[PDB]
Amino acid sequence: WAFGYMISRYSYYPQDKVVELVDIMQKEGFRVAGVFLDIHYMDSYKLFTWHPYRFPEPKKLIDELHKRNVKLITIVDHGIRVDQNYSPFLSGMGKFCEIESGELFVGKMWPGTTVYPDFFREDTREWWAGLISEWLSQGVDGIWLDMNEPTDFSRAIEIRDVLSSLPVQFRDD
Amino acid sequence: WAFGYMISRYSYYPQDKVVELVDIMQKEGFRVAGVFLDIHYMDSYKLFTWHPYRFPEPKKLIDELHKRNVKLITIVDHGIRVDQNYSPFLSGMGKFCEIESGELFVGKMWPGTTVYPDFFREDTREWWAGLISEWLSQGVDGIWLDMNEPTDFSRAIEIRDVLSSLPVQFRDD
């Protein structure tokens, strides 16, 4: 099924619209293997969370998709939000990337201020596998890893803040 | 009396305070020949006007000062406010400075957007003499001409608007 016809967008939501679209596609004769859910499904772009208003009942969505024989693939970025009450941030502590001087590498990504997992380490990899596994257990069929170059926007944003008001054009480096 | 002791400030107001100060000076033995009124006495820095709140009764002030044998000297700048309902602007029309291309030279000074009298012309001189004469007739004893280099702030303000944002410091040219 990974080689079947996949539909995706940035993004499809709320959950009822996802099902409505799949139904119309199938009704008109298109065999859809799976649908991709882009970042709008998350709560404030926080990894491993569901938007409380757009996706109040994810279980219902997964069941509806599976009843229709459609796989669900969810995007997962690499940025962990520096949030005091965000579980992944607290549990991942100790396994994030650092900078030469010893502090954590704090940057900028979709969820705002963020830290990044140091995937080169065994414990980080194990910790991540755990979150993924837990995420897959709801019935999610696939993982879409994005922005994993790895990408960071703190430098770009820093430039945009300092020369924001200046009526000039920035080169695209 | 022009060689006597003059007190001034930028500025003395409202009118009751001007008289109070002169009284204290005289009571303590200082022979004051005259007091200078800086730009705060004008209405929005408009030449030949009295601030409706600080100097609501100019005649009363002048009389109070004259009763105490104290002359009154008022500052008069060279900028005419580009104001649709400002008399000097309307009556001076035709006698203001222009730029090479023919339009009026519109700049910036205390009253904001302003035009300037072309004093090199005899007609402008006659027009100005008229306003001065009319101004002196209330009992004003002297004229203090300021900013008549002539000075203009449109270039400075133009620079400050475009580079206002930059955390950089400007050279004082």
Q: A150 preceded by cis ω (within 30°)?
A: yes
| Alpha-carbon gap, residue B64 to B16, rounded angstroms | 10
Please pick, among A57, A63, A126, A146, the residue that the annotation labels catalytic.
Answer: A146
**Token pair for B50:** 């009295």
CB–CB contact B167 A162 (8 Å): yes
Which three-class secondary structure string do you get for chain B?
CCCCCEECCCCCCCHHHHHHHHHHHHHCCCCCCEEEECHHHCECCECCCCCCCCCCCHHHHHHHHHHCCCEEEEEECCCEECCCCCHHHHHHCCCECECCCCCECCEEECCEEEECECCCCHHHHHHHHHHHHHHHCCCCCEEEECCCCCCCCHHHHHHHHHCCCCCCCCCCC
Query: Which chain A residues have a beta carbon less than 8 Å from that of B163?
Result: 166
Told to judge if B149 belongs to the known catalytic residues of this protein, a careful annotator would answer: yes
**Token pair for B152:** 């203009």
CB–CB contact A165 B165 (8 Å): yes
CB–CB contact A166 B165 (8 Å): yes
Q: At what angle do helices A15-27 and A58-67 cross, to 10 degrees?
A: 10
Q: What is the resolution of this structure in A?
A: 2.5
Those residues of chain B whose CB sits closer than 8 Å to some CB in chain A are: 162-167
Please pick, among B103, B122, B149, B173, the residue that the annotation labels catalytic.
Answer: B149
Query: Which chain B residues have a beta carbon less than 8 Å from that of A164?
Result: 165
| Shortest CA distance from A164: residue in chain B | B165
Told to judge if B146 belongs to the known catalytic residues of this protein, a careful annotator would answer: yes
| Alpha-carbon gap, residue A20 to A151, rounded angstroms | 34
| Shortest CA distance from A165: residue in chain B | B165
Query: Which chain A residues have a beta carbon less than 8 Å from that of B167?
Result: 162
Those residues of chain A whose CB sits closer than 8 Å to some CB in chain B are: 162, 164-167
Name B2's Cβ contacts closer than 8 Å, sequence gap at least 6. B33, B142
Please pick, among A149, A161, A172, A173, the residue that the annotation labels catalytic.
Answer: A149
Closest Cα in chain A, distance from residue B155 (Å): 18
Q: Could you write out the DSSP letters of every residue in chain A? A: -TTSEEE--TT--SHHHHHHHHHHHHHTT--EEEEEE-GGGSBTTBTT---TTT-S-HHHHHHHHHHTT-EEEEEE-SPEE--TT-HHHHHHTTSB-B-TTSSB--EEETTEEEE-B-TTSHHHHHHHHHHHHHHHTTT--EEEE-STTT---HHHHHHHHHSSSS-------
Closest Cα in chain A, distance from residue B165 (Å): 6
Q: Are B43 and B114 in contact (CB under 8 A)?
A: no
CB–CB contact A166 B166 (8 Å): yes
